[PDB]
Design a protein around this nucleic acid. Sequence first.
RNA 1: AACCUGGUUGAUCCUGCCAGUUACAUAUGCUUGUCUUAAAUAUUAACCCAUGCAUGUGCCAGUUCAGUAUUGAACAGCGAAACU
Length: 49
Amino acid sequence: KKEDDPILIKKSVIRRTFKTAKGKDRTKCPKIQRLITPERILRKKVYKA
RNA sequence: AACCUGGUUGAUCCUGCCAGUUACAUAUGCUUGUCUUAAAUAUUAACCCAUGCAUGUGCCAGUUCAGUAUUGAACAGCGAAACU
Ligand SMILES: [Mg+2]
Ligand SMILES: [Mg+2]
Ligand SMILES: [Mg+2]
Ligand SMILES: [Mg+2]
Ligand SMILES: [Mg+2]
């Protein structure tokens, strides 16, 4: 849902899991762009200031 | 260094050039031992060109699910590619 909490977006992002050519075991995650974080809102407040 | 000398006649004083002398550029011939500098395919053909190189660029501050590393379970170090 749109009304939904950002942390629900955080928890639902896909994980990638894979085996390195070296034979190692690793897991990679994407970063969320557009995400509403405290930092965005702070910057906004400061500009209006 | 504000200087001139040789050549017309049988001899002479003139005009006048030629020639010498001087510097400086290219060129060249012979000859070349140190040290300090150092121009350099302008002139002829803005003629023709094999090959190599002479224009690239990343920070903490645009984009990383590359990779690496057993990394704050959204990423967070290092760091391609590729957008910008
Ligand atoms: Mg006469
Ligand atoms: Mg005579
Ligand atoms: Mg003369
Ligand atoms: Mg010596
Ligand atoms: Mg690059």
